[PDB]
């Protein structure tokens, strides 16, 4: 765990990556607000099952008590879905690749009340990734950092792992040729995006709560409890 080298950490996280799932998109019909929310939540639900298995493969996570594992995942699940979405969407300017069969533009986001605002933030973040030329190895480090960090102040072991992931990011950047100053500058640029992902998660959680509270879409028992955790 804390014993892993930088390269071993990267390989572990790369091996742990979940598959890219398909949506139930039905191209025979136009979208409604209800059918679009149904597609996205149906997708989220199936991704959550893979997320749980992925989390258990992040170094140090299964050493935590079950209660702390639950808390971290409850806190981070939507940040984790969103950073994955933004990563998948990098090579598709102006579009969000929810799934290979569900590539949506901001105009399609208007189909759901209050959703285009959140699409616009996700698209902006994807553009930021693109212009930074975010690498796959950096992405998997960031996503694991979100898992371990977002709920961590609501433990010394967690921070040791987080420190190891920092070491790993720096390792990757040095290996890619960045100067010593470029390494700390890029480390900071990448970590500051985590503040933007938190923000998007909080706005998306409020959005999903509204959709629920308006009976727009029936949420799975899992989604109801994940949403409930945010009280």
């Amino acid at each position: 765990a804390l014993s892993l080298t930088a390269d071993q950490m990267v390989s572990a996280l790369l091996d742990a990556e979940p598959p890219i799932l398909y949506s139930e998109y039905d191209p025979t019909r136009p979208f409604s607000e209800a059918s679009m929310m149904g597609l996205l939540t149906n997708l989220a639900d199936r991704e959550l099952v893979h997320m749980i298995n992925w989390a258990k493969r992040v170094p140090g996570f299964v050493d935590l008590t079950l209660h702390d594992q639950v808390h971290l995942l409850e806190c981070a699940w939507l940040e984790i879905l969103m950073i994955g979405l933004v990563w998948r969407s990098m090579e598709h300017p102006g579009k969000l690749l929810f799934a290979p069969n569900l590539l949506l533009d901001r105009n399609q986001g208007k189909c759901v009340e209050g959703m285009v605002e959140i699409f616009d933030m996700l698209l902006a973040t994807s553009s930021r990734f693109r212009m930074m030329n975010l690498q796959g190895e950096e992405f998997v480090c960031l996503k694991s950092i979100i898992l371990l960090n977002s709920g961590v102040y609501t433990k010394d072991h967690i921070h040791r792992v987080l420190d190891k992931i920092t070491d790993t990011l720096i390792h990757l950047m040095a290996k890619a040729g960045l100067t010593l100053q470029q390494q700390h500058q890029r480390l900071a640029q990448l970590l500051l995006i985590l503040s933007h992902i938190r923000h998007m998660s909080n706005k998306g959680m409020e959005h999903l709560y509204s959709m629920k509270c308006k009976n727009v879409v029936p949420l799975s028992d899992l989604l109801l409890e994940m949403l409930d955790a945010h009280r």
Partner: peptide, 11 residues
Amino acid sequence: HKXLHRXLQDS
């Protein structure tokens, strides 16, 4: 216990 608590054990 939360559903997640159980799901985390299957593994």
